[PDB]
Ligand binder design. Structure first.
Ligand SMILES: NC(=O)C1=CN([C@@H]2O[C@H](COP(=O)(O)OP(=O)(O)OC[C@H]3O[C@@H](n4cnc5c(N)ncnc54)[C@H](O)[C@@H]3O)[C@@H](O)[C@H]2O)C=CC1
Ligand SMILES: Cc1cc2nc3c(=O)[nH]c(=O)nc-3n(C[C@H](O)[C@H](O)[C@H](O)COP(=O)(O)O)c2cc1C
Ligand code: SF4
Ligand code: SF4
Ligand code: SF4
Ligand code: FES
Ligand code: FES
Ligand SMILES: [K+]
Lengths: 430, 213, 263, 44
């Protein structure tokens, strides 16, 4: 296939994405969920890991690590310690609200994904670290887990396979940094959500000291559909090394902000004008698109005309795919006010552990707050660039990178607008 | 907004806090979710339970969570001051949380923040004199396609206009509890002018299942 | 022997498995700059001053925490190592207060010394700094928390060596404060040693406060007599008057600590 | 009757402040016995 997009409704993983069907167990089993789960479990860990490696599933959390390669880090003998699958249901990214829709509307798909994935990785239980702000979704998920226990689908002799597997839900308490997998581990362990250093990776030392795989809600929930439909079905969508389907959250300055499941390498312009009704005021009213939530660099209108919405074509467009959360910004936007608000978010959501983020993200927020007013000089733009290059790569987790990249995208694509802002400040205040 | 504690007469280690017995059974069920020997992993739920029984956290809820989990009290103080939900001051009975990040600021959450301010007569951080409404300004609540939106105590009120949040505040003052949903026409997250996808009926069990399973 | 071969600046050195990159550089006689690493505290890795380049690797690694792999060529003096050191030092000095004359740590400050050694020579910080409320943790340890670089040597010492578990970090981000969160008094029997390990004048000795200055002190190596441990100490004098008592390192007695009575 | 016009997820309009914790209290009977580290806490 050469052009991508226009996904059919029969080829959807997240049926009942919109809350239009029964999310409970009798509705979920009537939509293909929990069907032949025992036959998936009995074929061993190696078969399930091979079906995930065949499918080409990458990490839907946003970094895009190969999911089968990541989950095969647990295919190793027991050293006395138990093993844990941990579902990352935090979703603190601005723009991103897809995991809320999975937990709220397809919860049994997440529970079956916990069972199948923890069977693949030999795990003992599933700790679903859900966001603390998602209370109704957490009780929603707990109702589904009660329905899964009472049907014998999980717990003692899960689905009649002789495999014991629990599913726990831990609520967060209001920290974006607790979506980072090691800080999420530290938050489950009852401490401040500060990220660990790597190595040890969580497959070696994870939650409680155990072998542990943290994986996103989407990359876990699509795994029983990969096991039932086959890995080649999932690899038959999107470009090569960009396989599958993907949830997209188009918000901001579009006519109909919405969540949509779409084929992987869909064009951005087609996605916006097909599922969201296009940019408000027309496509010529488009100023910028933050393609994948707040951490990715923005791209202007001259990149959004031709770009594909997968990992590799956005890396080649000097941005990232991230969480596939499309924030659309029209010509009426003070883009410096939006990016400075985004940097303000990253200094409010920063755990204070290491030096470059703790100091430099606040220092970038002060510089961006002066750039909104134009209370600066153009030699501070390049300086700000250097500050971002001192935060990027030198921090413990990638929130320093995710704070550096909006600054770098704004400078790289809108340096003249910053310079005219500052020179008009200078000529109206002197 | 501070991160050191000073003993007021209403916030001290002699402030009366204690769990109800049904909350003690809830704490037992919480601690049974974690391995034997890692009881400290129950700091974040139980302390949040102390915020649901009491409304806020004095420094006797923190010391009680420290005592019943056999953890040092500083390890509960760190959790209480790290995570933004734990109210270390008393908030109003309805805790209005306006999201003002970029996907909501682009869809005019400023007008709704102004509407709540000019309605309640307060500003951000202040509590109304009847102790019913506390207005603060929070980061991304994870409901970005339903922007603009607020959170009240469990609930997301979404796709709001200033009239809609005025009406929600009017019926919160009247005692009723509103419906946590988008105040526009749509239901959860669909496109607002009809479904662009998932119009066909879902297939059901057995569809597309590979051979050898 | 299961010793693996690693390279520090191209020089071969045989290390035990599980050796950190900092210890591999230390075996060839090179000291990596550090603020949170302390060889008797647990590894935190939260100051990023130890970031060193491994060659053919497009990312500096925290040398205090990263174990060596077989055949890494550690580049202690390469360009991106020096840029990492200068950037991290600039972030350490952005919100740090201009207290060097009124600070007791001056002349014996790690932040001063490896600002001179590994950082830039000027500021690009065109903003206002933070100021932190001072804490009261006793009549021994003066506390000026604007000078704190949040290296958590406090907390790791009080948790692991003193067994106190009362120091900690409150808050999040640039407002993360090291303290006890309450009006609580940190009085162990080893509570003075947090003055030794604090690389800045955030925690200072209140009896030694303002009285002397380390370049004019004569360091007489001597023995404690307050207990029967025989802790090796430095008596530092100035113009024939005893100014303070510091610890000496003896691996078999007092490793590098002394009690509060000795101090 | 195929319905694609009404929002079937209406249960969270009746969740109180203790819905999650009472669901955890209910689910406490379905669960496997926890593993043991071999000590009461890492300060033991
Ligand atoms: N979904 C959300 O709400 C948010 C998502 N993000 C995304 O998070 C991304 C950053 O995530 P990170 O995990 O920090 O990036 P990445 O460097 O670490 O790693 C991605 C995954 O691969 C695994 N991995 C990579 N190399 C490995 C190795 N050698 N051994 C074992 N496991 C290995 C890690 O354990 C991790 O789970 C950003 O690009 C952003 O798009 C960021 C913020 C919020
Ligand atoms: C600051 C930060 C926040 C993150 N938040 C989330 C999150 O909320 N949800 C998520 O799935 N991944 C989040 N991630 C990505 C995780 O580190 C991790 O890659 C992912 O959760 C699990 O891997 P996966 O993508 O294969 O599922 C975050 C990363 C960082 C650096
Ligand atoms: S860079 Fe920021 S988010 Fe990461 S460990 Fe450091 S303080 Fe935490
Ligand atoms: S701690 Fe060091 S750098 Fe800071 S004021 Fe004191 S002597 Fe100067
Ligand atoms: S007071 Fe000193 S030892 Fe303690 S965290 Fe701050 S800089 Fe480190
Ligand atoms: S930006 Fe307001 S909810 Fe995500
Ligand atoms: S010394 Fe390695 S980061 Fe502090
Ligand atoms: K000191």
């Amino acid at each position: 296939k050469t052009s991508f997009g226009s996904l059919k409704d029969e080829d959807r993983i997240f049926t009942n994405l919109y809350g239009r069907h029964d999310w409970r167990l009798k509705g979920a089993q009537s939509r293909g969920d929990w069907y032949k789960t025992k036959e998936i479990l009995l074929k061993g860990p190696d078969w399930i890991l091979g079906e995930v490696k065949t499918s080409g599933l990458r990490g839907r959390g946003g970094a895009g690590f190969p999911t089968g390669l990541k989950w095969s880090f647990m295919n190793k003998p027991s050293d006395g310690r138990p093993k844990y699958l941990v579902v990352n249901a935090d979703e603190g990214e601005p723009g991103t609200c897809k995991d809320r829709e999975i937990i709220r509307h397809d919860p049994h798909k997440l529970v079956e994904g916990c069972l199948v994935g923890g069977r693949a990785m030999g795990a003992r239980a599933a700790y679903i670290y859900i966001r603390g702000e998602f209370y109704n979704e957490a009780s929603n998920l707990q109702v589904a887990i009660r329905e899964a226990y009472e049907a014998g689908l999980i717990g003692k002799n899960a689905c009649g396979s002789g495999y014991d597997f629990d599913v726990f839900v831990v609520r967060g308490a209001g920290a974006y940094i607790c979506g980072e997998e090691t800080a999420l581990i530290e938050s489950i362990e009852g401490k401040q959500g500060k990220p660990r250093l790597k190595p040890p990776f969580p497959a070696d030392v994870g939650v409680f000291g155990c072998p542990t795989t943290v994986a996103n809600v989407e990359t876990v929930a699509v795994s029983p559909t990969i096991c039932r439909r086959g890995g080649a079905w999932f690899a038959s969508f999107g470009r090569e090394r960009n396989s599958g389907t993907k949830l997209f959250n188009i918000s901001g300055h579009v006519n109909n902000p919405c969540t949509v499941e779409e084929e992987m390498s869909v064009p951005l312009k087609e996605l916006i004008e097909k599922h969201a009704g296009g940019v408000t005021g027309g496509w010529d009213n488009l100023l910028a698109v933050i393609p994948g939530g707040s951490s990715t660099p923005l791209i202007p209108k001259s990149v959004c005309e031709t770009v594909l919405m997968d990992f590799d074509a956005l890396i080649q467009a000097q941005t990232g795919l991230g969480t596939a959360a499309v924030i659309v910004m029209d010509r009426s936007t003070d883009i410096v006010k939006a990016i400075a608000r985004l940097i303000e978010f990253y200094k409010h959501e920063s755990c204070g552990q290491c030096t470059p983020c703790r100091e430099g993200v606040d220092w970038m927020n002060k510089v961006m707050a002066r750039f909104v007013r134009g209370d600066a000089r153009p030699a501070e733009i390049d300086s700000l660039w250097e500050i971002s290059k001192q935060i990027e790569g030198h921090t413990i987790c990638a929130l320093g990178d995710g704070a550096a990249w909006p600054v770098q995208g704004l400078i790289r694509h809108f340096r003249p607008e910053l310079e005219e802002r500052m020179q008009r400040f200078a000529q109206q205040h002197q | 907004a501070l991160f050191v504690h000073r003993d007021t007469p209403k916030n001290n280690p002699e402030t009366p806090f204690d769990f109800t017995p049904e909350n003690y059974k809830r704490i037992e069920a919480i601690v049974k979710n974690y391995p034997e020997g890692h009881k400290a992993a129950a700091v974040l739920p139980v302390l949040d339970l102390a915020q649901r029984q009491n409304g806020w956290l004095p420094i006797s809820a923190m010391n009680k969570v420290a005592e019943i989990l056999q953890v040092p009290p500083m390890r509960v103080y760190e959790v209480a001051t790290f995570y933004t939900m734990y109210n270390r001051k008393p908030v109003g009975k309805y805790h209005i949380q306006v999201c003002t990040t970029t996907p909501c600021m682009l869809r005019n959450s400023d007008s709704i923040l102004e509407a709540i301010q000019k309605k309640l007569g307060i500003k951000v951080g202040e509590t109304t004199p009847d102790k019913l409404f506390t207005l603060i300004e929070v980061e991304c609540l994870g409901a970005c396609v339903n922007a603009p939106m607020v959170q009240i105590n469990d609930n997301y009120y979404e796709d709001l206009t200033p009239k809609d949040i005025e009406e929600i505040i009017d019926e919160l003052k009247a005692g009723k509890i509103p419906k946590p949903g988008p105040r526009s026409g749509r239901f959860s997250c669909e496109p607002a002018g009809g479904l662009t996808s998932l119009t066909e009926p879902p297939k059901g069990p057995g569809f597309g299942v590979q051979a050898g399973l | 022997s299961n010793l693996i071969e690693v390279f520090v600046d191209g020089q071969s050195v045989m290390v035990e498995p599980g050796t950190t990159v900092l210890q591999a550089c230390e075996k060839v006689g090179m000291q990596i700059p550090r603020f949170c690493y302390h060889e008797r505290l647990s590894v935190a890795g939260n100051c990023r001053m130890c970031l060193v380049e491994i060659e053919k690797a497009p990312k500096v690694v925290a040398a205090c925490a990263m174990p060596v792999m077989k055949g890494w060529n550690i580049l202690t003096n390469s360009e991106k190592t020096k840029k990492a050191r200068e950037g991290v030092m600039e972030f350490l000095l952005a919100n740090h207060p201009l207290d060097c004359p009124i600070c007791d740590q001056g002349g014996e400050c790690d932040l001063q010394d490896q600002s001179m050694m590994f950082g830039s020579d000027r500021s690009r910080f065109l903003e206002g700094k933070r100021a932190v409320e001072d804490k009261n943790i006793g009549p021994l340890v003066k506390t000026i928390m604007t000078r704190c670089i949040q290296c958590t040597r406090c907390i790791r010492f009080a948790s692991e060596i003193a067994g106190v578990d009362d120091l900690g970090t409150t808050g999040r981000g640039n407002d993360m404060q090291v303290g006890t969160y309450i009006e609580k008094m940190f009085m162990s029997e080893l509570s003075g040693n947090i003055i030794d390990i604090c690389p800045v004048g955030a925690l200072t000795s209140k009896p030694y406060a303002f009285t002397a200055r380390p370049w004019e002190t004569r360091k007489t190596e001597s023995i404690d007599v307050m207990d029967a441990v025989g802790s090796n100490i430095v008596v530092s004098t100035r113009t024939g008057e005893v100014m303070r008592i510091l610890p000496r390192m003896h691996e078999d007695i007092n490793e590098e600590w002394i009690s509060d009575k000795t101090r | 009757p195929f319905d694609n016009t009404t929002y079937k997820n209406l249960q969270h309009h009746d969740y109180s402040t203790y819905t999650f914790l009472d669901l955890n209290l209910d689910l406490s009977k379905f669960r496997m016995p926890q593993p043991s580290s071999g000590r009461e806490s890492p300060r033991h």
